[PDB]
């Protein structure tokens, strides 16, 4: 059958990044060669595996992690990479396999005020794990005095709001991103194409 | 071939700590996704987290944040899970699993399953 | 936790075909995420029947099957006997990267 792409690039909403959503999928027959000629993807970089010629070759399961972040935001969604999102909000790993396919959205996620829901992660005692979403919201401890579950002087919530708006640049714009992840294991490949 | 060993049973104060080991054996530790599972005394399964250690990383579940802190030595080839902050609530039977077909994404089924280890918490 | 709702008790018959179903949610089954089956006898480790909705290991007999839907998973046990007397659980995985498990039917001869 054809494959389910359309739940999940023209969904209705994608989850912010500090709680990203990963949906598998198996049983396809799938042409990624349609999703290269889009016109609307801006960023379209394929690692482990190069692009214009995924229509040769299956997989396992597909797994496409997807969130949604600024402009200026873009470049940390890689292998290597660092700042306030790949450190403490979404941590690739080094050898990943797969694109991270990102387009300009500011019609659909970013309202005129603040869109005050599109959070992401700021304080962490430490650097992320690779693939390893924390959901936590407990009150980071910045000095040496005990926080005692009070925000104040040195105890600061980890999520601040991005804060979308229309007039502001095309680097404060909420750039959707979704990330095809897959990679295949010791079994028979399920997901390709003609 | 393959198969998991876990900890005698133990018996903890309620207010104190508990650490619950699961030796692998019969392959690799590098490719395991060793995630840990509760059962209650005659009730359902239950999920706490799965660690993958060639990465480190450590997907808890909800209402298991900060309480079970599950660490992996990959050397010794015994995975972890140091539950804190014991009450009378959590005599259970944890269970460890590996999960199936792969060791990155580690969504599958669990198989095998290790043993029981009676974590009667109370005095 | 345990999204994957389950009946508590199926009952049958010694040659009968019962039913058991799994109705989940559209993050944890309508995600693309399989079911899989485990068995448990009273006082031991649960075992696994059925991974990828279809297949079966070395070690069941031909009378458990299973098969997806939509958003519903089922299993079916033709002909009961007397070690098909256990509990029988429904796993699968949120989009919240968090395993659910099933509650758990209870199979009873008659």
């Known amino acids: 059958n054809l494959c389910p792409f359309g739940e999940v690039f023209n969904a209705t909403r994608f989850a912010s990044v500090y709680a990203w959503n990963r949906k598998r999928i198996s049983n396809c027959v799938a042409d990624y060669s349609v999703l290269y000629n889009s016109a609307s993807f801006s960023t379209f970089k394929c690692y482990g595996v190069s692009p214009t010629k995924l229509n040769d070759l299956c997989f396992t399961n597909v797994y496409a992690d997807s969130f949604v972040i600024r402009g200026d935001e873009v470049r940390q969604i890689a292998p290597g990479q660092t700042g306030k999102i790949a450190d403490y909000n979404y941590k690739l790993p080094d050898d990943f396999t797969g694109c991270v396919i990102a387009w300009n959205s500011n019609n659909l996620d970013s309202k005129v005020g603040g869109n005050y829901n599109y959070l992401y992660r700021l304080f962490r005692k430490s650097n992320l794990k690779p693939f390893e979403r924390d959901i936590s919201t407990e009150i980071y401890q910045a000095g040496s005095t005990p926080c005692n579950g009070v925000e104040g002087f040195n105890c600061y919530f980890p999520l601040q709001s991005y804060g979308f708006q229309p007039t502001n640049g095309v680097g404060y714009q909420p750039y959707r991103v979704v990330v095809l992840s897959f990679e295949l294991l010791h079994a028979p490949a399920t997901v390709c194409g003609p | 071939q393959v198969q998991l060993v876990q900890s005698g049973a133990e018996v903890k104060k309620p207010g104190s700590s508990v650490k619950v080991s699961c030796k692998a054996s019969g392959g690799t530790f590098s490719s395991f996704a060793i995630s840990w599972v509760r059962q209650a005394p005659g009730q359902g399964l239950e999920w706490m987290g799965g660690?993958?250690?060639?990465?480190?990383?450590?997907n808890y579940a909800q209402k298991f944040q900060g309480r079970v802190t599950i660490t992996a030595d990959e050397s010794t080839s015994t995975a972890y899970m140091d539950l804190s902050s014991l009450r009378s609530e959590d005599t259970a039977v944890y269970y460890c699993?590996?999960?199936?077909?792969?060791?990155?994404?580690?969504?599958?089924?669990?198989?095998?399953w290790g043993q029981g280890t009676l974590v009667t918490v109370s005095s | 936790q345990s999204v994957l709702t389950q009946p508590p008790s199926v009952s049958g018959a010694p040659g009968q075909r019962v039913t058991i179903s799994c109705t989940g949610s559209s993050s944890n089954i309508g995600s693309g995420y399989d079911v899989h089956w485990y068995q448990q006898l009273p006082g031991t480790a649960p075992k696994l029947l059925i991974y990828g909705n279809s297949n079966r290991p070395s070690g069941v007999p031909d009378r458990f099957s299973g098969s997806k839907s939509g958003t519903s998973a089922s299993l079916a046990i033709t002909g009961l006997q007397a070690e098909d007397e256990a509990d029988y659980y429904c796993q699968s995985y949120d989009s919240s990267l968090s395993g659910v498990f099933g509650t758990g039917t209870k199979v009873t001869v008659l």
């Open positions: 660690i993958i250690p060639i990465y480190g990383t450590a």
């Open positions: 699993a590996r999960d199936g077909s792969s060791t990155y994404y580690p969504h599958n089924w669990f198989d095998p």
